[PDB]
């Protein structure tokens, strides 16, 4: 475990992370995709061997000894708000199980279903609160990665609120 488990947020490419493992915002078919998924494919392409997994699940594949946890959030274009909310919570619970199983002291994590799977809605708070619900019982240092300046401020505020 980390000596004093923390949450932090950084605004940069998750492919440049300083953590012991990464969570990919994956598609169910293990395809290169767009956004975070494409960045992850360029940095760790070996981790896409047999990475396909259903919505609401996570599947870990090693790139050398570096673990890539492929977490499949729902595409809100296809799911109802209710069913998508259930699958988004479930994907993060599976990430917490994998982080624990791996024995890592730190993890880099993007906000699932906030980009091209958002169905055109702002899901920062929804996605971040499901992240916290899953990760709060883990003792890894969590570093959340985002690209938008206003999102960085809002994520930082939400972390600092609960300290
Ligand atoms: Cl960058
Ligand atoms: Cl997304
Ligand atoms: Cl962002």
UniProtKB/Swiss-Prot annotation:
Effect of residue 117 to V/W: Almost complete loss of mono-ADP-ribosylhydrolase activity
Disulfide bonds: none
Subcellular location: Host cytoplasmic vesicle membrane
Domain of life of the source: Viruses
Post-translational modifications reported in the UniProt record: Phosphorylated by host on serines and threonines.
Sequence ranges assigned to domain Macro in this UniProt record: 4-163
Binding of ADP-D-ribose, residues: 13, 27, 35, 115-117
Topological category with respect to the lipid bilayer: Peripheral membrane protein
Domain observations: In the N-terminus, the macro domain displays a mono-ADP-ribosylhydrolase activity. The central part called, the alphavirus unique domain (AUD) has a zinc-binding function. The C-terminus region, also called hypervariable domain (HVD), is mainly disordered and binds several host proteins. This intrinsically disordered domain contains 2 SH3 domain-binding sites and 2 FGDF motifs necessary and sufficient for the formation of nsP3/G3BP complexes.
Protein role: Seems to be essential for minus-strand RNAs and subgenomic 26S mRNAs synthesis. Displays mono-ADP-ribosylhydrolase activity. ADP-ribosylation is a post-translational modification that controls various processes of the host cell and the virus probably needs to revert it for optimal viral replication. Binds proteins of G3BP family and sequesters them into the viral RNA replication complexes thereby inhibiting the formation of host stress granules on viral mRNAs.
Quaternary context: Interacts with mRNA-capping enzyme nsP1. Interacts (via C-terminus) with host G3BP1; this interaction inhibits the formation of host stress granules on viral mRNAs and the nsp3-G3BP1 complexes bind viral RNAs and probably orchestrate the assembly of viral replication complexes. Interacts (via C-terminus) with host G3BP2; this interaction inhibits the formation of host stress granules on viral mRNAs and the nsp3-G3BP2 complexes bind viral RNAs and probably orchestrate the assembly of viral replication complexes. Interacts (via C-terminus) with host NAP1L1.
UniProt name for this protein: Non-structural protein 3
Organism: Chikungunya virus (strain S27-African prototype) (CHIKV)
Full-protein interval shown: 1334 to 1493 of 2474
């Amino acid at each position: 475990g980390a000596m004093a488990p923390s949450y932090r947020v950084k605004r940069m490419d998750i492919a440049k992370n300083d953590e012991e493992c990464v969570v990919n915002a994956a598609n169910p078919r293990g395809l290169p995709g767009d956004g975070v998924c494409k960045a992850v494919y360029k940095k760790w392409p070996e981790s896409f061997k047999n990475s396909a997994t259903p919505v609401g699940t996570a599947k870990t594949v090693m790139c050398g000894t570096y673990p890539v946890i492929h977490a499949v959030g729902p595409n809100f274009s296809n799911y109802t708000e209710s069913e998508g909310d259930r699958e988004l919570a479930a994907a993060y619970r599976e990430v917490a199980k994998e982080v624990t199983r791996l024995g890592v002291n730190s993890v880099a994590i993007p906000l699932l279903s906030t980009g091209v799977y958002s169905g055109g809605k702002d899901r920062l708070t929804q996605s971040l609160n499901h992240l916290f619900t899953a990760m709060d019982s883990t003792d890894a240092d969590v570093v959340i990665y985002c690209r938008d300046k206003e999102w960085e401020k809002k994520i930082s505020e939400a972390i600092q609120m609960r300290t």
